[PDB]
Amino acid sequence: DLGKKLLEAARAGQDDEVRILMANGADVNAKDKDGYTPLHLAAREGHLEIVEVLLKAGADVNAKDKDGYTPLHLAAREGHLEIVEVLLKAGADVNAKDKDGYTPLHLAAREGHLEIVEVLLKAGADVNAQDKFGKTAFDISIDNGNEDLAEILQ
């Protein structure tokens, strides 16, 4: 099954493998057990050229895993700035909420990725979005004593 192969190749950052698999009929929207797609996996792992290739092939940019994580959640959490930008341009939902109401802004804030936060804000991220415990990205910045983050957000 080619879908499984593309998932592994996307996760492992095997550009030439991704290219050959796709050239030979691999499903770009293949899903693993947890609802991860090749795009989730590449975005998480930092494989920018694979991300760009999947996007162009019509990969669902807003695919959700079983917990409502999109590829943008994973890229913003992991600090892959270039991948974050490419996703947003491809129509990524900057305000997508996972099962617990966490947005990519929450995850970038929580991880302390300032540059990602700026990009998310410029692209329409809701500063007032609250998770299931009622916390905002600003709340996180106050917890961590992150003055640069707090400012950017408020």
Q: Would you mind telling me the total number of residues written for the chain in this entry?
A: 154
Between CA 150 and CA 33 the distance in angstroms is 38
Count how many domains the chain has. 1
The enclosing domain of 130 has a CATH number of 1.25.40.20
- CA 37: distance to chain centroid? 11
**For the stretch 107-132, what's the b/e string if a residue is b when 16 or more beta carbons lie within 10 angstroms of its beta carbon?**
bbbbbebbebbebbbebebebebbbe
Experimental method: X-ray
- CA 70: distance to chain centroid? 5
Q: Can you give the residue range of the structural domain that contains 85?
A: 1-154
Find, among 98, 95, 91, the residue nearest to 120 by Cα: 95
The residues near 109 (Cβ < 8 Å, ≥ 6 apart) are 117, 137, 138, 140, 141, 149, 153
- Take residue 34 and report the two structure tokens written for it: 């947890």
Residue type, 1: D
Between CA 110 and CA 2 the distance in angstroms is 36
Find, among 2, 78, 14, the residue nearest to 40 by Cα: 78
Between CA 4 and CA 6 the distance in angstroms is 5
- Take residue 72 and report the two structure tokens written for it: 């943008």
Can you list the pairs that 55-60 forms with residues at least 24 positions away whose Cβ atoms lie under 8 Å?
A: 55/86, 55/87, 55/90, 57/22, 57/28, 58/28, 59/28, 59/29, 60/29
Between CA 96 and CA 119 the distance in angstroms is 15
